[PDB]
Design a protein around this motif. Structure first.
Motif, PDB file in Angstrom:
ATOM      1  N   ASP A  29     -27.405 -44.185  82.947  1.00 30.63           N
ATOM      2  CA  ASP A  29     -28.799 -44.602  82.687  1.00 30.63           C
ATOM      3  C   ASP A  29     -29.476 -43.834  81.536  1.00 30.63           C
ATOM      4  OD1 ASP A  29     -30.765 -42.601  83.751  1.00 30.63           O
ATOM      5  OD2 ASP A  29     -31.995 -44.380  84.165  1.00 30.63           O
ATOM      6  N   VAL A  30     -28.842 -42.745  81.098  1.00 35.07           N
ATOM      7  CA  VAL A  30     -29.226 -42.084  79.858  1.00 35.07           C
ATOM      8  C   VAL A  30     -28.484 -42.798  78.745  1.00 35.07           C
ATOM      9  CG1 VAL A  30     -29.366 -39.897  78.549  1.00 35.07           C
ATOM     10  CG2 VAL A  30     -29.466 -39.847  81.051  1.00 35.07           C
ATOM     11  N   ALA A  31     -29.221 -43.575  77.962  1.00 34.72           N
ATOM     12  CA  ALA A  31     -28.662 -44.373  76.883  1.00 34.72           C
ATOM     13  C   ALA A  31     -28.598 -43.599  75.577  1.00 34.72           C
ATOM     14  CB  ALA A  31     -29.483 -45.639  76.696  1.00 34.72           C
ATOM     15  N   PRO A  70     -42.434 -37.867  73.516  1.00 37.02           N
ATOM     16  CA  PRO A  70     -42.432 -38.129  74.958  1.00 37.02           C
ATOM     17  C   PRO A  70     -41.634 -39.387  75.276  1.00 37.02           C
ATOM     18  CG  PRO A  70     -44.671 -37.853  74.064  1.00 37.02           C
ATOM     19  CD  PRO A  70     -43.761 -38.069  72.911  1.00 37.02           C
ATOM     20  N   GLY A  71     -41.257 -39.537  76.541  1.00 35.20           N
ATOM     21  CA  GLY A  71     -40.567 -40.728  77.005  1.00 35.20           C
ATOM     22  C   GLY A  71     -39.203 -40.973  76.406  1.00 35.20           C
ATOM     23  N   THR A  72     -38.456 -39.903  76.133  1.00 38.52           N
ATOM     24  CA  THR A  72     -37.077 -40.026  75.650  1.00 38.52           C
ATOM     25  C   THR A  72     -36.038 -39.590  76.676  1.00 38.52           C
ATOM     26  OG1 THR A  72     -37.426 -37.942  74.471  1.00 38.52           O
ATOM     27  CG2 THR A  72     -37.483 -39.994  73.192  1.00 38.52           C
ATOM     28  N   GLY A  73     -36.428 -39.543  77.948  1.00 30.22           N
ATOM     29  CA  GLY A  73     -35.494 -39.291  79.032  1.00 30.22           C
ATOM     30  C   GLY A  73     -35.062 -37.845  79.195  1.00 30.22           C
ATOM     31  N   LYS A  74     -35.856 -36.914  78.655  1.00 26.90           N
ATOM     32  CA  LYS A  74     -35.514 -35.490  78.638  1.00 26.90           C
ATOM     33  C   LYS A  74     -35.287 -34.960  80.032  1.00 26.90           C
ATOM     34  CE  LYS A  74     -38.862 -34.089  75.888  1.00 26.90           C
ATOM     35  NZ  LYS A  74     -39.166 -35.086  74.833  1.00 26.90           N
ATOM     36  N   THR A  75     -36.209 -35.271  80.924  1.00 24.69           N
ATOM     37  CA  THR A  75     -36.064 -34.838  82.297  1.00 24.69           C
ATOM     38  C   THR A  75     -34.784 -35.360  83.011  1.00 24.69           C
ATOM     39  OG1 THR A  75     -37.196 -34.702  84.402  1.00 24.69           O
ATOM     40  CG2 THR A  75     -37.492 -36.695  83.096  1.00 24.69           C
ATOM     41  N   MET A  76     -34.328 -36.556  82.655  1.00 26.13           N
ATOM     42  CA  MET A  76     -33.112 -37.082  83.276  1.00 26.13           C
ATOM     43  C   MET A  76     -31.867 -36.502  82.643  1.00 26.13           C
ATOM     44  SD  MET A  76     -32.123 -39.566  85.729  1.00 26.13           S
ATOM     45  CE  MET A  76     -30.492 -39.323  86.424  1.00 26.13           C
ATOM     46  N   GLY A 225     -38.128 -44.796  75.292  1.00 27.92           N
ATOM     47  CA  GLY A 225     -37.536 -45.537  76.386  1.00 27.92           C
ATOM     48  C   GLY A 225     -38.589 -45.828  77.423  1.00 27.92           C
ATOM     49  N   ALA A 226     -39.697 -45.095  77.318  1.00 28.90           N
ATOM     50  CA  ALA A 226     -40.839 -45.243  78.203  1.00 28.90           C
ATOM     51  C   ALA A 226     -41.672 -46.446  77.760  1.00 28.90           C
ATOM     52  CB  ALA A 226     -41.656 -44.007  78.167  1.00 28.90           C
ATOM     53  N   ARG A 229     -39.863 -49.510  78.740  1.00 28.54           N
ATOM     54  CA  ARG A 229     -40.185 -49.849  80.111  1.00 28.54           C
ATOM     55  C   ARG A 229     -41.529 -50.552  80.210  1.00 28.54           C
ATOM     56  NH1 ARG A 229     -40.675 -49.211  85.590  1.00 28.54           N
ATOM     57  NH2 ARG A 229     -38.444 -48.685  85.911  1.00 28.54           N
TER      58      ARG A 229
HETATM   59  N1  LIG Z   1     -31.720 -42.717  77.234  1.00 26.44           N
HETATM   60  C1  LIG Z   1     -33.068 -42.783  77.349  1.00 26.44           C
HETATM   61  N2  LIG Z   1     -33.877 -42.239  76.394  1.00 26.44           N
HETATM   62  C2  LIG Z   1     -35.229 -42.303  76.483  1.00 26.44           C
HETATM   63  N3  LIG Z   1     -35.899 -42.870  77.508  1.00 26.44           N
HETATM   64  C3  LIG Z   1     -35.206 -43.450  78.527  1.00 26.44           C
HETATM   65  C4  LIG Z   1     -33.721 -43.445  78.514  1.00 26.44           C
HETATM   66  N4  LIG Z   1     -33.316 -44.082  79.635  1.00 26.44           N
HETATM   67  C5  LIG Z   1     -34.442 -44.460  80.303  1.00 26.44           C
HETATM   68  N5  LIG Z   1     -35.570 -44.076  79.648  1.00 26.44           N
HETATM   69  C6  LIG Z   1     -36.990 -44.314  80.043  1.00 26.44           C
HETATM   70  O1  LIG Z   1     -37.788 -43.131  79.857  1.00 26.44           O
HETATM   71  C7  LIG Z   1     -38.726 -43.029  80.933  1.00 26.44           C
HETATM   72  C8  LIG Z   1     -38.895 -41.595  81.402  1.00 26.44           C
HETATM   73  O2  LIG Z   1     -38.721 -40.676  80.330  1.00 26.44           O
HETATM   74  P1  LIG Z   1     -38.506 -39.097  80.649  1.00 26.44           P
HETATM   75  O3  LIG Z   1     -37.075 -38.838  81.179  1.00 26.44           O
HETATM   76  O4  LIG Z   1     -39.739 -38.674  81.434  1.00 26.44           O
HETATM   77  O5  LIG Z   1     -38.595 -38.497  79.135  1.00 26.44           O
HETATM   78  P2  LIG Z   1     -39.316 -37.133  78.612  1.00 26.44           P
HETATM   79  O6  LIG Z   1     -38.881 -36.041  79.589  1.00 26.44           O
HETATM   80  O7  LIG Z   1     -38.703 -37.062  77.229  1.00 26.44           O
HETATM   81  O8  LIG Z   1     -40.819 -37.396  78.599  1.00 26.44           O
HETATM   82  C9  LIG Z   1     -38.206 -43.877  82.085  1.00 26.44           C
HETATM   83  O9  LIG Z   1     -39.263 -44.724  82.571  1.00 26.44           O
HETATM   84  C10 LIG Z   1     -37.059 -44.700  81.516  1.00 26.44           C
HETATM   85  O10 LIG Z   1     -37.264 -46.117  81.674  1.00 26.44           O
END
Ligand SMILES: Nc1ncnc2c1ncn2[C@@H]1O[C@H](COP(=O)(O)OP(=O)(O)O)[C@@H](O)[C@H]1O
Length: 292
Positions: A29-31, A70-76, A225-226, A229
């Motif tokens: 799910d990390v693209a 922000p919203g680049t999936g850093k936490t995942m 990626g946010a 969504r």
């Molecule tokens: N590979 C990816 N890169 C960036 N965003 C993603 C990826 N995969 C999923 N997302 C989206 O990013 C959102 C959450 O981002 P998050 O992990 O909080 O990033 P950050 O920690 O950079 O703010 C999710 O709602 C999801 O749909």
């Protein structure tokens, strides 16, 4: 709960909503992010798998900093990294510390490193760490540095602190110094964006074709990626809005499939959250501080 004693409510707070453990979830799910994926594997996973090999000059950094828009999936990314080292995961925001949990915070920053310290291998994820490293705020912000120098004072411990930030240009020399490695996590590649979309559409009735994917890719330049969504939710509203009053009676299966125009229109409402001037202020910061 054993071998240690703080307020027994602190401990629960940790077991309950910081402590986490996910096995064998790969990158799922990390693209994209091939660059960073490679690096984290080299600098953290490999080292946690073979601490017999990675000693001396081959020791891993104790502190890695992920930064980008922000919203680049850093936490995942952090959650996957933890999952591949078969490590105990600790997720925590610096805002949850400097607001939601103050006074109690300093006692918690301590207990965090203690728990982590005995769930080895452990990975500590601190989101929005730039706030923490810039009032009870200072009392905590101190205990933190205390805690995190200790990490650089135990040699053969498989304990990594992983910090994330949208505002790295906000960290001073002594701050950045706590981070041997500094990874730029940037906005989805074109191909990445559409993989996201495909994940998000699973379970939703749609007629998106590969030829369509390409059009979407075309007008989602600059999207996180946010945002993607956000895009999908909005696009999914198209069918919903075509109904009106049958809405409360209609069969969910009779709901119009999501289509490309849904996205085309959606794109008009949902716009990128990152200003081009910022992407530069990141690239500049990166080439002058990042592990490129
Ligand atoms: N590979 C990816 N890169 C960036 N965003 C993603 C990826 N995969 C999923 N997302 C989206 O990013 C959102 C959450 O981002 P998050 O992990 O909080 O990033 P950050 O920690 O950079 O703010 C999710 O709602 C999801 O749909």
């Amino acid at each position: 709960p054993t071998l240690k004693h703080f307020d027994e409510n602190i401990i629960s707070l940790i077991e309950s909503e910081i402590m986490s453990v996910n096995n064998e979830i790969g990158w799922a799910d990390v693209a994209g992010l091939e660059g960073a994926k490679k690096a984290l594997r080299e600098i953290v996973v490999l080292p946690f798998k073979r601490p017999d090999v990675f000693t001396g000059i081959r020791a891993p950094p104790k502190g890695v900093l992920l930064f980008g828009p922000p919203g680049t999936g850093k936490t995942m990314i952090g959650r996957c990294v933890a999952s591949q080292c078969k490590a105990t995961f600790f997720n925590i925001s610096a805002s949850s510390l400097t607001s939601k949990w103050v006074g109690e915070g300093e006692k918690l920053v301590r207990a965090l490193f203690s728990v982590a310290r005995l769930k080895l291998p452990s990975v500590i994820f601190i989101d929005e760490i730039d706030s923490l490293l810039s009032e009870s705020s200072r009392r905590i912000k101190t205990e933190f540095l205390v805690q995190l120098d200790g990490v650089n004072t135990a040699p053969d411990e498989r304990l990594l602190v992983l910090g994330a930030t949208n505002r790295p240009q906000e960290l001073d020399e002594a701050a950045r110094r706590r981070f041997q490695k500094r990874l730029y996590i940037a906005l989805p590649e074109p191909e990445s964006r559409t993989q996201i979309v495909q994940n998000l559409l699973v379970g939703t009735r749609h007629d998106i074709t590969n030829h369509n994917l390409e059009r979407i890719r075309e007008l989602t330049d600059g999207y996180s990626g946010a945002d993607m969504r956000q895009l999908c939710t909005e696009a999914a509203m198209g069918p919903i809005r075509d109904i009106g009053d049958d809405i409360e009676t209609i069969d969910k299966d009779d709901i119009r499939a999501v289509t490309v125009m849904d996205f085309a229109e959606a794109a008009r409402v949902v716009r990128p959250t990152v200003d081009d001037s910022q992407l530069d202020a990141y690239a500049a910061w990166d080439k002058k501080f990042g592990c490129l």
